[PDB]
Write a protein that binds this ligand. Sequence first.
Ligand SMILES: [Mg+2]
Ligand SMILES: [Mg+2]
Ligand SMILES: [Mg+2]
Ligand SMILES: [Mg+2]
Ligand SMILES: [Mg+2]
Ligand SMILES: [Mg+2]
Ligand SMILES: [Mg+2]
Ligand SMILES: [Mg+2]
Ligand SMILES: [Mg+2]
Ligand SMILES: [Mg+2]
Ligand SMILES: [Mg+2]
Ligand SMILES: [Mg+2]
Lengths: 97, 86, 137, 100, 122
Amino acid sequence: SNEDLPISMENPYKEPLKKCILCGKHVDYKNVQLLSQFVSPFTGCIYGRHITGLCGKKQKEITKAIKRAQIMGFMPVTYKDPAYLKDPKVCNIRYRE
Amino acid sequence: AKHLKFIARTVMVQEGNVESAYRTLNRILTMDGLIEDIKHRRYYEKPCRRRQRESYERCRRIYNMEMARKINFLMRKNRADPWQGC
Amino acid sequence: TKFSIYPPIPGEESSLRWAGKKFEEIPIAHIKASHNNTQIQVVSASNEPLAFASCGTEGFRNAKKGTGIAAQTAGIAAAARAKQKGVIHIRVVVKGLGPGRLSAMHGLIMGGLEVISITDNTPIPHXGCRPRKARKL
Amino acid sequence: NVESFASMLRHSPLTQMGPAKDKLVIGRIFHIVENDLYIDFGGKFHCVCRRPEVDGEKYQKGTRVRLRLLDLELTSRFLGATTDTTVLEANAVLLGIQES
Amino acid sequence: PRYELALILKAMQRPETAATLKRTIEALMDRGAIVRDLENLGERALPYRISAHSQQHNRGGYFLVDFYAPTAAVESMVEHLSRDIDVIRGNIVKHPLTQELKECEGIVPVPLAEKLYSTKKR
RNA sequence: CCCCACUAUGCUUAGCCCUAAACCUCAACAGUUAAAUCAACAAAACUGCUCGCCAGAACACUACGAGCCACAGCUUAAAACUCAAA
Ligand SMILES: [Mg+2]
Ligand SMILES: [Mg+2]
Ligand SMILES: [Mg+2]
Ligand SMILES: [Mg+2]
Ligand SMILES: [Mg+2]
Ligand SMILES: [Mg+2]
Ligand SMILES: [Mg+2]
Ligand SMILES: [Mg+2]
Ligand SMILES: [Mg+2]
Ligand SMILES: [Mg+2]
Ligand SMILES: [Mg+2]
Ligand SMILES: [Mg+2]
């Protein structure tokens, strides 16, 4: 017949599924430096997933890890640890502007 | 009461411009949601009323974000008429 | 160096000085801006009372107290009594969201005091006492 | 020996381009309104680009320019809609003037 | 199974801290636990003030105790740590390495919900 | 209705009480999106099968009988008179 007819295939141009910054990495409640990167530097409020950019699974992990660290003397509650104020900025939030 | 003081929600005044610093402090509290939390905590909001308010705000957010997306999507069409007279 | 909105850490060493006094030694001006009244107290680093003023102690009574101008009057008076004891620079710790939240701070500025840091210490319970019932207005 | 439509579609330059995102193409300016340039790059819909300030005098009718396509057609489905909202135009970023 | 004891000790001298760690470990062994490893995360200032046994603590040393103990041994150890005056705070949790993190394919985009309302002409 | 003070109560233990706009007022399981899609509105229209329930309004979340740790209670639940509407 005709060899130019379209064939059935999966999309070859399909880009790989996007992954969060913490995809494939363990989250531990003792890893305070990682946890402090997802709380406000003035109030210590836990940022939402619209700010952190994490997926559903890691957002739950960070929230559970932060809550465990706060009660076990690893993470401050009312503020963000000053020693970790110079970490790379990964949350899409701006206060002064 | 048991945390270090003068760290949380503290803004340093630059060159004596107190007006800018206070607005910066006010905006930070608003962005984190502290300002709205305090006002609703003045009088107790019953659980039935809170869920109705939250559902209204969540529905409001969906409509606000969807309408905003369409406005930005159609903003490129705000140019002048390219076929004037037709 | 670039200005940092974050306060210096008491443990760390910082080059910022105000009339030869470090940030931890600056007297503190606590402001309590309630919905009906504003109370301003200035204390030193060693928790020594220096000056206290309020709308009720500055010729305002009843509903007149819950106004910005009344808080501004108290702020000027609080600065005047603090300035007698040698207070120049203050750290502002404002508590409450009352009408005199900012106007009371203006009185301190116009009274001869300098503001270097602003802190909000409004009490927000994290779940706490159940507040009063809603008003049927 | 008649070329079938499937043969025409397979060998057409548009089909062999693949995805239109971040592809350099050459378009022709056919209509100009103020500083808005209407450029047709052989697709179904044309693209509208602002007149560059560096060399805006050269951009005239019939001038060929270089484009980086971002979408052949701009459509998006919003809340409560049963169909996508189409702008009847393409999205492209103007880069320069094609020279031979 | 395998547990992890997030142990925060009062800032003391080396002989006193060393005695406390040995005494705490012996409590686990007396309750059938098999201690795996003893880790030292250092000593840093506590994020918030902690009051315990009518003492105000501003600094404390961080240690981690990994051990294998039966389920019934967890309850007994918690009661033991409360009576110890040299322990600022002691919490027993599952060892995070025991849980296996499921491999994540990525993020699947969520399409806009459709057919939520009838197509009647309102 | 506004303001203040304070008690039952909201908490814990043990035993009761068994009600709600207990409402997502939209039954369980297995399906379909085709025809006539479909009163209206609401949250599109239906198929197979089974169970529960409903037959004008009011009297009536009532009377009586019965059962219940309930005794100013709950569950089950009428009738006469009346109206031509609800
Ligand atoms: Mg406390
Ligand atoms: Mg009482
Ligand atoms: Mg319910
Ligand atoms: Mg029902
Ligand atoms: Mg059933
Ligand atoms: Mg079904
Ligand atoms: Mg219809
Ligand atoms: Mg009833
Ligand atoms: Mg009855
Ligand atoms: Mg009977
Ligand atoms: Mg009876
Ligand atoms: Mg029943």
